[PDB]
Structures are given as structure tokens and as C-alpha cells.
Amino acid sequence: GRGDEFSTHEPGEKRLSQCMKQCERQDGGQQKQLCRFRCQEKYKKERREHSYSRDEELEL
Structure with missing residues (x-):
């Protein structure tokens, strides 16, 4: 009995999550x-690349 559908999550979506984090701030x-607009386009164009990265954020 599978019941409620279950599936794994794509690491690529994590980059978009950062866009939401930045946009809110x-x-x-x-x-x-x-x-949000540019992230969607970037997401569509790249699809996948890095699970986690740091560039826009400032260390100090």
C-alpha cells in the first residue's frame, strides 16, 4: 500500500531556495x-550545477 506519494528532492532546487532567502531580505x-525573475530564468537555463555555493553573500 503505497498510499501517499513519496519522492526524493533535487539538490538543484536548493539554489532557488537561496533566491527566496535573498529576495525576502x-x-x-x-x-x-x-x-525571483532572474533566478527562474537561471534555473531553467542551467537546470543543475552545484548543490551548494557561496558568491552573492558577504563573509564580512
């Missing part, structure tokens, strides 16, 4: 609009 409304 951004002020105004325009900032949120493009940050």
Missing part, C-alpha cells in the same frame, strides 16, 4: 520582483 517591492 531585500527591501522595497521592485527588488523582490527581479531577483
Whole structure:
């Protein structure tokens, strides 16, 4: 009895999750609009690459 469907999660989606994290912290409304927009395009174009990466964030 499989019941409720169950499946694994793609590591690629994690990068998009970071976009949501960054977008939320951004002020105004325009900032949120493009940050999500470009991430979707990047997600579609790249599909997959790195499970975890650090670039936009500042160490200090």
C-alpha cells in the first residue's frame, strides 16, 4: 500500500531556495520582483550545477 506519494528532492532546487532567502531580505517591492525573475530564468537555463555555493553573500 503505497498510499501517499513519496519522492526524493533535487539538490538543484536548493539554489532557488537561496533566491527566496535573498529576495525576502531585500527591501522595497521592485527588488523582490527581479531577483525571483532572474533566478527562474537561471534555473531553467542551467537546470543543475552545484548543490551548494557561496558568491552573492558577504563573509564580512
